[PDB]
Design an enzyme around this catalytic site. Structure first.
Site, PDB file in Angstrom:
ATOM      1  N   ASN A  74     102.919 -41.176 -55.820  1.00 28.36           N
ATOM      2  CA  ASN A  74     103.556 -41.182 -54.503  1.00 28.36           C
ATOM      3  C   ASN A  74     104.970 -40.600 -54.500  1.00 28.36           C
ATOM      4  O   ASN A  74     105.782 -40.905 -53.626  1.00 28.36           O
ATOM      5  CB  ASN A  74     103.528 -42.592 -53.898  1.00 28.36           C
ATOM      6  CG  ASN A  74     102.115 -43.075 -53.625  1.00 28.36           C
ATOM      7  OD1 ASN A  74     101.232 -42.287 -53.281  1.00 28.36           O
ATOM      8  ND2 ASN A  74     101.891 -44.372 -53.786  1.00 28.36           N
ATOM      9  N   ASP A 103     107.191 -40.975 -47.962  1.00 31.07           N
ATOM     10  CA  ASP A 103     107.784 -41.972 -47.066  1.00 31.07           C
ATOM     11  C   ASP A 103     106.992 -42.200 -45.776  1.00 31.07           C
ATOM     12  O   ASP A 103     107.541 -42.603 -44.749  1.00 31.07           O
ATOM     13  CB  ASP A 103     109.237 -41.588 -46.751  1.00 31.07           C
ATOM     14  CG  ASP A 103     109.368 -40.202 -46.126  1.00 31.07           C
ATOM     15  OD1 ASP A 103     108.363 -39.461 -46.033  1.00 31.07           O
ATOM     16  OD2 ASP A 103     110.497 -39.851 -45.727  1.00 31.07           O
TER      17      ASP A 103
END
Ligand SMILES: CCn1nccc1-c1c[nH]c2ncc(-c3ccc(N)c(C(=O)N(C)C)c3)cc12
Length: 263
Positions: free
Chosen positions: A129, A142
């Site tokens: 991520n 995000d």
């Protein structure tokens, strides 16, 4: 608002599918390659609302949204090299050297210090991520950020499943999440970086990890990892959430290490 875009402003090039309905696209006006997240409804629209408030060099920047009518778009900058996990596994280690590893940890901790400052929580911090651009630029994905006053806790929905090996013990046992569970996950991320993308707790089945963490088992120092960096890892893995360092403290430590390694 200034964020609202026409759907026809973007043409989709290629589908990117571990991230879901995510596409490489072209913002035709600017000839700019962009990333586009497409689509429940209310959760998706909140994602877009939160991203409007995020402004940091190391968090993926929102470029526009299509939220008036379905299908809905979230349009962000495109990170050319994809996720950090695969980047680390496939890299030239002579290029992606120890100083580069510090540089990336410094960038990630900067983004997390920002979230800590701005009362946001990530809840899924891992190398998969984080996204990589040119010149070892690293940005934290995000798209799933949540509003939570720094210090407050979140209780996960019943029957929630977690990536166990990145998940803090209080989250595993009580479904409780806070900025300190992000600090824990960051420690695991540090280990991923130090090992160039090895899977954490290798060979240990997830269902047995919590019992080990109770007994004060932690992953050993990776080969070639500096003691200072491993000490930070271990501080992130303190059993008591309040004993773990803040991201402000973590970022200061890495910035100092990066500046010293450069000199
Ligand atoms: C909101 C849109 N979104 N949802 C999730 C991620 C992104 C994203 C934003 N900006 C991005 N910039 C680049 C990429 C990207 C590009 C190439 C890749 N090979 C990969 C990759 O790692 N694989 C395994 C598919 C990821 C993904 C995103």
């Amino acid at each position: 608002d200034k964020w609202e875009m026409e759907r026809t402003d973007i043409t989709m090039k290629h589908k990117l599918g571990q991230f879901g309905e995510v596409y490489e696209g072209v913002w035709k006006k600017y000839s700019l390659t962009v990333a586009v997240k497409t689509l429940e409804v209310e959760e998706f629209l909140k994602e877009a609302a939160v991203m409007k408030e995020i402004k940091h060099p190391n968090l993926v920047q929102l470029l526009g949204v299509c939220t008036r009518e379905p299908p809905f778009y979230i349009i962000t900058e495109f990170m050319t090299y994809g996720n950090l996990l695969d980047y680390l596994r496939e890299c030239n280690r002579q290029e992606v050297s120890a100083v580069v590893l510090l540089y990336m940890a410094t960038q990630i901790s900067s983004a997390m210090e920002y979230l800590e400052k701005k009362n946001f929580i990530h809840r899924d911090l891992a190398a998969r991520n984080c996204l990589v651009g040119e010149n070892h630029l690293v940005k934290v994905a995000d798209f799933g950020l949540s509003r939570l006053m720094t210090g407050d806790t979140y209780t996960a929905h019943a029957g929630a499943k977690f990536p166990i090996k990145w998940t803090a013990p209080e989250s595993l046992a009580y479904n409780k999440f806070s900025i300190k569970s992000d600090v824990w996950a960051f420690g695991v991320l540090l280990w991923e970086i130090a090992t160039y993308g090895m899977s954490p707790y290798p060979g240990i089945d997830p269902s047995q990890v919590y019992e080990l963490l109770e007994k004060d088992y932690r992953m050993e120092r990776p080969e070639g990892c500096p003691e200072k960096v491993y000490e930070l890892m271990r501080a992130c893995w303190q059993w008591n959430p309040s004993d773990r360092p803040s991201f402000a403290e973590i970022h200061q430590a890495f910035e100092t290490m990066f500046q010293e390694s450069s000199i």
